[PDB]
Design a protein around this ligand. Structure first.
Ligand SMILES: [Fe+3]
Ligand SMILES: [Fe+3]
Ligand SMILES: [Mg+2]
Ligand SMILES: [Mg+2]
Lengths: 423, 423
């Protein structure tokens, strides 16, 4: 079994490091004064970057891999996506959900993602997707720790037996309580749904992740209730507000007032760059707003924010390979976090900040933690992001669970020359 | 007594039709293969259009015919209208209300309107106008089925004994419960007033028609509560949201979310083109918004919407002859429903859609229904609208109750020539 990771670079640290492994955990981390020789039981990072696993804080595995079945969304709109999904209803079975969820999970394993939070639609009396996902969670456990959010897609108060189904999902084992206040029939139902959501989370000791204000409506301010209730219950760490795209459209004075509460509450925020840029701003003609939440300002204020892929190869987002560096690339551009340091520190948005959002207790390259880490063939976060590098090795419990042999590019000039896209 | 209506054109149908009458009802409707000869007991539509009666879904008969008494509204503003009305207070008596209401009702009978819903101000401890209108309703019954809305003009919670007076109006026989949430002192009073309105409608088994969001305020969203409460009680068919002019100013994202609820709720919408274009947009300088609700989008979404005249010859609207084709003409222009089909189908906005809004159970040219129909001297809806044709004949219970001999225009060129404005 592997005993050491050598010649490792670490974010924010100078030089090379050696990570000692014992009994599936990191026993010690020591600096090196030079390059160490390879040997049996040593995994050579080759001066590449070693980081804790990538995290997917927000994805919908119940709808993944269904784009084009039976027809393609040709307009690319949300409306048509709903219709295309409805045409596939006859194929939505227990086995179908498991098969598609596993397909995307395999892409995630290949992409060094060892933690995934999936939302599952529970506005279905049969809870078909949920039952399937609970089995998938057990099956994929050796490679990925999967959290399941009971997501009442059609609303809690605006759908028949919505609250009862949400609670049933928790009784069956869902890890997180979801909600969608802006989709409820009225603002009052929206606020009330949040009180019910928090009551359920406290009753069952579960986390909370609300699809919050995902709409270009400057009056959609459910985020203040999410933050206020979290602060009241002293449970900010266990709470997440996903999307909050409406915040992109708030006036600055209200946003400034709100930010004080957001910081005090300690809640987490998830932005989904690939889907937000695609689905937001659809009611604008020109100019067209970007529609991503205030990521830059959150970072400047010390508010925890991270990035999710949201959807992969489905009616609402036809693209994706479940790659977090790709999600990060889109977010840095749309949020204008393009300074060198902002880009370099970007890795935090798909690693540490996301681990905090999932309330993970065993995460990070530190003595005592499980030996879960990945190796990127790049010098730092900036380099990894610029070159969209693959994951050279993914290690879990001190064992390699994924590896990618890099592509080899050659140009034939007066003489053949290898191209690695580095200067 | 009349036995048949011959040579009739019907909207959306090809050719000519014969409508057989018996015992005040339509016994059968048969297609003709050519023009039928006239004869005793046959009313010849002369290839004109036959439709069920025009409907006035929203008018204020308690204030009608008072413009210029004792003074004229010179600015044309809402503010001055209130002052001009106040100067006439000494003339507001039982007999005065009946006289003016009857004057407009006669214009409506002449204009082929057999169904009228009038709002009556019940923010008056003496309920003078209501008592008068209840007598008018009985008196005009042979010609018009009049519905009375108990309209709490000064608010339910914002006026002394407002709720008690609203209920008293229902106990006296008002057919519909009214409300005006945006006029209440606070948003909270607005929402609460709607709960009270729905409770009264269920307690007395009455319809509901709310003066809803008649204001250029993008934050006036009482329509979502009207729709949500209707959906909750499963009574959409009995509910109407009048005006909703604020919807003209909503952002598109919220409107899209709202529309799902509007469709699911099944409630009705009334737009009042002549008054809305006049009174809305008054706080804008330039550019100036139109201020009519989203009629085109409602039609595209299958949401029932129709047109009312609102006011006739009073301080708030000095014009009008209570003519529905004139109301329709204004609405088609302001709502940009100017395609041929949109204009031709326009008749639905002042006939069938309005009948649905009034929850009428005996309406339409169909076997078994009462023989209530009107004949327009035009080829179709487009032609009737373009030429603003009068009602040639109005038939109720199988008897003619109104008729108009068309004007005769002649131009004297090298020879006299009759002009009918057709090409
Ligand atoms: Fe989502
Ligand atoms: Fe009115
Ligand atoms: Mg989504
Ligand atoms: Mg009015």
């Amino acid at each position: 079994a592997l005993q050491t990771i050598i010649n490792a670079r670490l974010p924010g640290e100078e030089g090379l490091w050696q990570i000692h492994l014992q009994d599936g955990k990191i026993s010690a981390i020591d600096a090196q004064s030079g390059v160490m020789p390879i040997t049996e039981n040593s995994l050579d990072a080759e001066q590449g970057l070693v980081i804790p696993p990538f995290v997917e804080p927000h994805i919908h595995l119940d709808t993944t891999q269904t784009a084009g079945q039976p027809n393609w969304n040709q307009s690319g709109t949300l409306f048509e996506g709903i219709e295309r999904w409805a045409e596939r209803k006859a194929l939505l079975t227990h086995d179908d959900v498991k098969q598609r969820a596993w397909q995307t999970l395999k892409w995630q394993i290949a992409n060094g993602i060892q933690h995934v939070r999936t939302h599952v639609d529970v506005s279905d009396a049969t809870l078909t997707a949920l039952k399937a996902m609970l089995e998938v969670k057990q099956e994929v456990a050796p490679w990925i720790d999967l959290q399941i959010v009971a997501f009442p897609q059609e609303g809690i108060l605006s759908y028949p037996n919505g609250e009862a189904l949400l609670e049933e999902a928790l009784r069956l084992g869902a890890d997180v309580v979801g909600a969608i206040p802006h989709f409820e029939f009225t603002r009052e139902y929206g606020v009330e749904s949040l009180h019910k959501t928090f009551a359920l989370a406290q009753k069952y000791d579960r986390l909370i992740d609300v699809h919050c204000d995902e709409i270009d409506d400057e009056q959609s301010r459910f985020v203040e209730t999410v933050a206020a209730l979290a602060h009241h219950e002293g449970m900010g760490a266990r709470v997440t507000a996903s999307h909050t795209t409406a915040m992109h459209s708030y006036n600055g004075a209200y946003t400034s007032r709100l930010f004080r509460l957001l910081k005090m509450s300690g809640i987490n925020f998830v932005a989904n760059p690939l889907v937000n840029i695609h689905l937001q701003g659809r009611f604008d003609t020109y100019p067209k707003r970007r529609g991503i939440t205030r990521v830059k300002e959150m970072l400047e204020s010390g508010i925890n924010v991270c990035f999710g892929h949201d959807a992969v190869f489905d009616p609402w987002y036809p693209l994706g390979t479940a790659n977090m560096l790709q999600v990060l690339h889109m977010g840095l551009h749309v949020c204008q976090l393009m300074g060198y340091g902002q880009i370099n520190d970007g890795l935090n948005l798909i690693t540490h900040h996301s681990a905090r959002t999932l309330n993970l207790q065993d995460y990070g390259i530190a003595a005592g933690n499980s030996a879960n880490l990945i190796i990127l063939p790049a010098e730092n976060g900036f380099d990894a992001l610029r070159r969209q590098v693959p994951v050279r090795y993914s290690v879990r419990g001190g064992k390699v669970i994924a590896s990618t042999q890099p592509a080899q590019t050659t140009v034939y000039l007066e003489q053949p020359e290898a191209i690695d896209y580095k200067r």
